[PDB]
Enzyme design. Structure first.
Site, PDB file in Angstrom:
ATOM      1  CE  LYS A 162      76.803 130.907  92.295  1.00 20.56           C
ATOM      2  NZ  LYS A 162      76.400 132.200  92.098  1.00 20.56           N
ATOM      3  CB  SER A 232      76.234 131.743  88.262  1.00 16.14           C
ATOM      4  OG  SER A 232      75.748 133.092  89.486  1.00 16.14           O
TER       5      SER A 232
END
Ligand SMILES: Oc1nc(O)nc(O)n1
Ligand SMILES: Oc1nc(O)nc(O)n1
Ligand SMILES: [Ca+2]
Ligand SMILES: [Ca+2]
Ligand SMILES: [Ca+2]
Ligand SMILES: [Ca+2]
Ligand SMILES: [Cl-]
Ligand SMILES: [Cl-]
Ligand SMILES: [Cl-]
EC number: 3.5.2.15
Lengths: 363, 362, 361, 363
Positions: A162, A232
């Site tokens: 992330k 992401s």
């Protein structure tokens, strides 16, 4: 004594639904103190203004903090929460919970599933999409490999990250400090953040040599890519969170991971190759799938196998939404299950228009 | 001797006729033998999609100049079926059907054939009810005969253009004192599509007449056709039936086969349709002319026991998502996203599924 | 017996932003135990799959529970949380916090607020008379909570109500029940509309003999002139906030209202300001907030001019209506940080909606 | 030498609706040979993949060609067709038809409406958003002023332009030719094309000196802007089409044009100023409006009067769609009529967050 990794793919009814995780904790199947990471597909738009990512993290952190008798802030320091928005097409919202137990048993024969987690420092806005992010991610990837007791980079099969994005306010903070940002656009900053993070994976694993990676290459030289990075972006954090997933000779897991690379968005052959690499050799052995994890994107050429599509021209529907619907549908058609993890925007993750695909399977 | 030719032509934009012009200018297509053009146009495929009319206008303008007639006449001579919505990787294209009579001998078996028939115009109160069903069924029988097909099992794709209900037609219904099937122009399309599709099933023996009533229309989803592909139109008041199949008396170098997608990710049905059309291995995939399929979001909100958000997603209309998914599945089997996938599948395949046909070279 | 209402309009940076409220609490301007309602504009899409509404409520409830030393469950039983999604156009995300305290001060009527909740509804009850009637009961309770006995002194009745999802429709079918409509977006209209008719029933704006299931979302000549209703996936009941003026109030604020006859009716904006005591542009600084309903007219037109709101498959009409009416209000008052909610079924005439102004006296 | 200009604002039922225009031709109120320009609001999305613009132009060109007995190709060479997509909010689709003819008539004596038209050469994709487009647009604006018999740039009140954009295929083709485009994003290419075109206007009218304009300034230095430029990008053309609108001593028109500049998207005061500049001094006189023409945009700051909005963050709805809905609503609320022309994206057209607004009115 011995690491044993258990992985639970849990259907969710809403971003804030913790009921399936609670059922597994309440039944004794998950000790919440052994959770090390949760990887979600949340049903927001998966782009800039997706607040399901944060809503899901807050809900899980509040629940686990109450269960563990600790603060939410300690939970988020201890557990990786990686929420990938966008559940387009038939893709089913769900979370994948990674549990690392310490067991008495010996290691299983051969190499079995191992996971490591590492967090980077927070990035200044002017570091996003540049070598500072690349190099700090690389350092964290090597740390997580060690956490997982994986020595050989070829035993790393999926690196899930992330990473941050640029908000208007963060850009303003950089210019107030006399700094410029890689791109003056929040949505494009997601691609630079994703791309720099993926190159850090590639550098850490020896997939690309360091002297080929520069600021000017980031989101420009698509010849450069990692075959296992999956990154992401989201508004809800300021650093990078890393989960290394691979196989270790020092593991008691009843699971393994394997992977391939989709050469384009309709490459079903790559899906079957990733299943084979995880020990799934026939259709009847697909009941051993725990999850399939993949990256999807619109090819810069505007085509797939020489056929035009409108993804990069469609002003009504962002192209990362379309890429997620497509790749999820392809995978779902191979494995017979649309509850798989597909994340969009695959800069320096597989070739231009493709992305890595991994399979976690029971042995 | 009947012969059907089919050309799948990539397009650069809704108004792009260059591909078709090339084939006419080279002699490979004679514009006079064109009977239908089936298009995927790159608008949103929903209510406010003007690419359908833009594409029809552009083609009718070009073909009226080449045939020396008016574009009003072109639209009467040629069936223009434009399905908007090219979501995911679906590639905009047109498929041109050419029907000609040549002087070649018998078929070595059964080869591609097309027939056409029209129904009577439908009083607004008749749409969505047995009147339309029963009339469509007759028309299919006629088109089957026109195609020289006498075995229903040799019908593999039945294109229908069917009417809908408008306000002025709503008032004409109460001007006579009879209500309509539904007080909505949007749902009248779904009632018209379903009725026409059940008329196909009736005509072909896919369902027993004893099971069809006004009450079952758009409620009894276990009743469906396996070959019908219906689209609701604003301009016609009758039903436009185009039967596509295989006739023992045809000179075509092409065949058609089909299957039924049981759901949106049913790749098994895609392979079955290919095999039914004579494509038995991945190596023979280059013989595909086109794949023609229907996509729809399942009413349960689930696929294979797994929830999805199509019916809850207020930003993206569910028909757009269904088209993206089914196109992606078919493309992953055949290696080519330039295939025809349309929405609106009432009584066309099961709920959440749709028919899928394959036209292939011999 | 004397109540004083204070109202704080607070800009937010994200759905979960509690920092402006915390600042007012930490500065001593707000005693959190005196908070009775929070009305938000959250920056999701305002339609079915808008989770910013639930995210905001959860964040506020967690924060208040910690501040008050009580559970989140108790907070949501005590405080109305009504989060209206959709901040289209220039509309500015914010929350409006209603604080009510008992005081001993000693003419004229001043701002009064009351809160009530209904029972949870089964999916098959939304958009039908059970929702109408239960809402009507709760409105009367909220009026008593506000110490308002005359319905002419109610100027805005804000409601949060449920909606249908595909999953909930399937639950209903498995129990042998048919829902009022199978389209999840249209279910918001039926829930909004039945809730608004419940207001009109409670206030005497419409007689009960005129309300039936067949009228709901069909007879647009039935409407409340003060109802403002908002639907969301995040709750299964209706929450009511009655806002009016009372002689038993020591507030330094008043509320006034009018009704926009259509989405460009700036005259109605100016009439609502004047009804709240703001008589000229020079007094606009006394606005606390402006609260309004917006919608696409069923005729597909405004003053005989066609628009595409009802035909646009890319953008749902309540999103467009919110952008339009917020813009109109903002251009009158000079400030886009005002509350505009879309979908005005049985809330003002077809194409219009109520508009209220809370103002310093 | 006297030119008489007439302007007809015509409601439309669809992009291809010519019925309102045909009624005016068939009643003798419009001689089709005297049409010089048509400015439309068409009900597509106003962004990259808006085909309603080309559908409207094709429909209008086919109708006029058959009416004039000439080819479609010759109609488009003779008549400016500027179709601005996006009819969001309550904005009503319509076309504005400009009729111009020489007349043997006496003095005005004041200045009255004047219109001129000019077309540029086609641009290569790599010329968009760069000085090649700026400079060629500037030349064409000067040609159009001369056509209008305006020699004083202060008598120019609105300069309406249609300009090109980049698609994925055009970007990829450029890459294959070894050429870099100004931006690798189809939606953003519209801003660069609008912005270069607008600086072309400012350069031509002397609003900005040439020494201040360079590639680096385009869509970067917001202090640089025209106060009368209105530019609109579309997939359906490869050149720029220019309509200059002002007032001339050599005009026999019964109409005038006035303008102001909206400082931000809610500046109703500037709407009233533009009405006053057109001779409309009270609400009673608003029946003299022929049309209102305005540019709208999201401010780069992400605010209006210090208040945040989400236009730049919303991945579901592009900001130019939002801006058009807002400014049309503000104008409609002042004039009581939403059938007015509002175009989105106002790069170098008024200040950052604002745009020019003009009123054509009966005297
Ligand atoms: O984001 C993007 N990249 C490329 O290469 N081309 C387009 O049209 N868009
Ligand atoms: O067609 C169009 N419309 C608007 O409002 N802006 C641009 O750039 N193009
Ligand atoms: Ca890639
Ligand atoms: Ca079906
Ligand atoms: Ca209303
Ligand atoms: Ca500007
Ligand atoms: Cl052929
Ligand atoms: Cl999609
Ligand atoms: Cl169905």
């Amino acid at each position: 004594h011995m690491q044993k990794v258990e992985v639970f793919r849990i259907p969710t009814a809403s971003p804030d639904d913790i009921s399936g995780l609670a059922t597994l904790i309440d039944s004794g199947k998950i000790n919440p103190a052994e959770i090390v990471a949760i990887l979600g597909k949340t049903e927001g738009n998966g782009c800039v203004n997706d607040f399901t990512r944060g809503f899901a993290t807050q809900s899980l952190a509040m629940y686990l903090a109450e269960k563990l008798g600790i603060s939410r802030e300690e939970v988020v320091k201890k557990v990786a929460f990686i929420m990938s928005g966008g559940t387009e097409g038939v893709m089913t919202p769900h979370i994948t919970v990674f549990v690392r137990k310490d067991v008495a048993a010996p290691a299983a024969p051969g190499k079995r599933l191992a996971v490591g987690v590492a967090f980077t420092r927070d990035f200044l806005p002017e570091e996003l999409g540049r070598m500072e992010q690349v190099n700090e991610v690389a350092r964290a990837v090597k740390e997580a490999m060690k956490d997982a007791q994986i020595d050989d980079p070829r035993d790393v099969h999926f690196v899930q990250i992330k990473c941050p994005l640029l908000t208007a306010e963060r850009i303003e903070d950089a210019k107030r400090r006399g700094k410029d940002v890689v791109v003056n656009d929040t949505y494009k900053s997601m691609a630079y953040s994703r791309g720099a993070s993926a190159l850090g994976v590639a550098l850490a694993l020896g997939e690309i040599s360091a002297d080929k990676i520069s600021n000017e290459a980031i989101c420009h030289d698509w010849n450069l890519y990692s075959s296992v990075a999956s990154t992401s972006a989201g508004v809800e954090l300021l650093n990078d969170e890393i989960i290394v997933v691979g196989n270790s000779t020092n593991s008691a897991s009843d699971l393994v991971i394997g992977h391939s690379v989709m050469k384009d968005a309709i490459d079903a052959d790559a899906v079957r190759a990733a299943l084979k690499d995880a020990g799934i050799r026939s259709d009847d052995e697909m009941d051993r799938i725990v999850n399939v994890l993949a990256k999807a994107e619109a090819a810069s050429s505007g085509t797939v196998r020489g056929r035009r599509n409108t993804m990069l021209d469609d002003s009504d529907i962002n192209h990362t939404r379309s890429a997620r619907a497509v790749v999820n549908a392809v995978i779902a058609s191979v494995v017979g299950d649309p509850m798989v993890y597909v994340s969009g925007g695959a800069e320096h993750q597989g070739p231009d228009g493709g992305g890595p695909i991994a399979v976690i399977a029971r042995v």
